[PDB]
Ligand binder design. Structure first.
Ligand code: BGC
Length: 440
């Protein structure tokens, strides 16, 4: 029934999804500025130019966090505000902005959990191949050093990357996210340079920090289940598990890349010399899990890689964009606890999108989202009872925002954002979380 007294309770955002102010105070161009301004890439014709205007309205965001009784806020720093050319001089005005924001959070009793990279690569670096180039890993580590030197007196909890599988595979192989390339080899090379950037940044951050830091990385993990026990379906489930989960977990754990996936990828696999793998496995203080969905896999040999397709279950609840499977959160946490070395663990994102509207009474009656949270929180209690060292939970998202290729049309907030007036309003699920946390 009861969570630990010192459990972290938060909500999460990312800079490009909320900030707006894309040209203000020296900000450079990111790959997502380029991509969202390319005709046809965003489903509803919107961009992040304004978004939630949180660059100016972060005080309102803090008011919401306080109204919800949270004790932490997960947000990202925009690399284009700090080093507008990607590699080059710093923009002190960008650092000063986040320094003021951090002081405002600490003044309100909210612990900042900062993500350094949440997908907004400076465009000048993409012009030089972006994550397809090892040089980008080096300059990412330089950016991490700069930020820690100025904010690390107040921020202890840092993550290097958010969801490298998305940046690599959606951005460079499937072409649905920025920068929008469609080449498997480039996607796998990007996955390696992301991991190398992470490892180089961890070392740089520890050397630059004015106090001991707690450094992690944030991964999306998808528990995978075969649709049947046939050799074909079990193999498809292992391939999908390797493609999303083990490709990242194993090198971070010091186990190299998974051999079964190297064999499957063949000539497309990156050249991973052992020096790189040692750097990638730099010791971490925590691991962040982003959990949304499971994969029930059936073999699909004529499909594209990894030749596994999803078998939908019409009996389970569905949101605006996903299938709901709360028990997968327990499963993946138990797997991490038993099979991998990372601890403690945080749930750095969990949430859902619905077709929310303001009702006649002025509230947002998002009962499915309340049920979503209740069901996932129950699974966390089960995981804690099994001994999983879980230390906090962050709802995605604090407020409705720019949901990447879906634009403003996919609402994940616990607070509703009116994108015309920029007013925020707490949804019923947000009041449920407030009252649940208060009872803890
Ligand atoms: O699609 C919902 C969320 O998915 C997570 O993978 C990303 O970190 C968020 O930025 C995104 O909004």
């Amino acid at each position: 029934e009861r969570f630990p007294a010192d459990f972290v309770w938060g909500a999460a955002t990312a800079a490009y999804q909320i900030e707006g102010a894309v040209r203000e105070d020296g900000r450079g161009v990111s790959i997502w500025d380029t991509f969202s301004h390319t005709p046809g890439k965003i489903a509803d014709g919107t961009t992040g130019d304004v978004a939630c205007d949180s660059y100016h309205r972060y005080g309102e965001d803090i008011g919401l966090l306080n109204a919800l009784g949270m004790n932490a806020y997960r947000f990202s720093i925009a690399w284009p505000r700090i080093v507008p050319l990607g590699a080059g001089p710093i923009n002190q005005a960008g650092l000063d902005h986040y320094s003021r924001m951090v002081d405002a959070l600490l003044g309100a009793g909210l612990q900042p959990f900062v993500t350094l990279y949440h997908w907004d690569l400076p465009q000048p670096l993409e012009d030089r191949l972006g994550w397809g180039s090892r040089a980008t890993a080096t300059v990412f580590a330089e950016y991490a050093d700069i930020v820690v030197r100025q904010l690390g007196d107040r921020v202890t909890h840092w993550a290097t990357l958010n969801e490298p599988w998305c940046s690599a595979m959606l951005g460079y192989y499937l072409g649905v996210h920025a920068p929008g390339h469609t080449d498997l080899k480039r996607g796998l090379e990007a996955s390696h340079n992301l991991l190398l950037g992470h490892g180089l940044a961890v070392q740089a951050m520890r050397a630059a920090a004015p106090q001991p830091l707690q450094i992690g990385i944030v991964l999306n993990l998808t528990p995978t289940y075969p649709a049947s026990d046939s050799p074909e379906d079990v193999a498809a489930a292992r391939r999908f598990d390797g493609f999303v989960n083990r490709w990242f977990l194993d090198p971070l754990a010091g186990r190299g890349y998974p051999q079964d996936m190297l064999d499957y990828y063949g000539a497309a696999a990156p050249q991973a010399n052992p020096e790189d793998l040692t750097q990638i496995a730099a010791p971490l203080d925590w691991l962040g899990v982003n959990y949304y969905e499971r994969m029930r896999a059936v073999d699909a040999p004529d499909a594209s890689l990894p030749q596994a397709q999803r078998l939908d279950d019409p009996d389970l609840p569905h949101t605006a964009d996903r299938e709901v499977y709360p028990e997968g959160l327990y499963d993946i946490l138990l797997r991490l606890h038993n099979d991998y070395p990372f601890r403690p663990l945080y749930i750095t994102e969990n949430g859902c999108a619905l077709h929310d509207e303001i009702a006649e009474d002025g509230g947002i009656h998002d009962g499915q989202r309340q049920a979503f949270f209740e069901a996932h929180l129950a699974q966390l209690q089960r995981a804690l009872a099994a001994g999983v060292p879980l230390k906090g939970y962050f709802a995605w998202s604090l407020l409705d925002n720019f949901e990447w290729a879906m634009g403003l049309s996919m609402r994940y907030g616990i607070c509703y954002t009116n994108f015309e007036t920029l007013e925020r309003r707490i949804k019923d699920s947000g009041y449920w979380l407030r009252d649940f946390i208060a009872g803890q």
